[PDB]
Amino acid sequence: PAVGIDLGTTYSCVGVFQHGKVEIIANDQGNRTTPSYVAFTDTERLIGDAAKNQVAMNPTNTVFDAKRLIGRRFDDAVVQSDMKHWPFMVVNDAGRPKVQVEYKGETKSFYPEEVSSMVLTKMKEIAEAYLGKTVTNAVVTVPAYFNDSQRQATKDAGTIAGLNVLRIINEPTAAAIAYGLDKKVGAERNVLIFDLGGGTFDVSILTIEDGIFEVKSTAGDTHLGGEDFDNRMVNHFIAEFKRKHKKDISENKRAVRRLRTACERAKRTLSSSTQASIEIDSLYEGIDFYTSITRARFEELNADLFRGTLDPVEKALRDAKLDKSQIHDIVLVGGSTRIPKIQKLLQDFFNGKELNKSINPDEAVAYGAAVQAAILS
């Protein structure tokens, strides 16, 4: 029983191909995606939903974004810039970066691939709970721009977790496999992947010749995702609360966190409804916060971020020596592509060409990895 695992920057996903169909496996809370969070307390180690739910109460020991550190050295310019926004420590150990936290009263340090192995261990256990069998073989996906060092450190994360990594494949290639684009018998196919996720945005252009994949160009934004859309909503409601009650809640970490989760939940509703309501009891100094927001207002708060996503698309087309009319298939990947304004922008950019989106975009990477896992097993 081989599984396909998407090891995401913010959310991870595991699937299994069996009986001619792919099953995306939900976790113990019923979620088909699991946050890439690891928390350390004085009693136990929390992974996934349980780790993210207590980040406000234990910020210095809750580790996330380990994918940004994996396969890199401490002297990397990206590593030094990212650690300026993390509440946890990142120390140097013979040139390698290590996260340092407090666990069971003592100090412990972990390499990035060790943190990712804990996430893979959770995805391994999520699959075993549904399958009722022991899971050993797996295909793990990585971004197309990952080098050998980053691909090897991801493979080591699977080995530490007890998995036998059958093959490391690219995330956009896995998305194209999910839609069977490599099985369309015909001429050469140019495929563009539009992957807008939690904190990252990746555009990839692939070429399928005789079922063989080739990465032609990559572009995007390493710090653009659904979290930036949530922050725009948070600042919107913070100013609204200050306007109504003459009080600023910015310095209350718990209040800001509770408002941020309500904004994220309201954002998901705005993809399927034209409005959503915020309901928080005793947000700040005993004052309840009951309001709403329309889809139009959500789009206006992110008009500059939404339309800016087409700049990497034009850059990827230009790097691949291709006109937009030369694209044969367009694939939507990442949970943020459920936003109707995002889909409208990309379809208008391609002059009304239909988009591949029937598969849940935050599950398409794990979907294709599961198909590849069954082929290689």
Ligand SMILES: Nc1ncnc2c1ncn2[C@@H]1O[C@H](COP(=O)(O)OP(=O)(O)O)[C@@H](O)[C@H]1O
């Ligand atoms: N129905 C929805 N509408 C809008 N945004 C969504 C929806 N579902 C999930 N999201 C957003 O998608 C993001 C998750 O991205 P995902 O691709 O799953 O993670 P990663 O980028 O790490 O792979 C979250 O920020 C979440 O807010």
Ligand SMILES: [Mg+2]
């Ligand atoms: Mg992703």
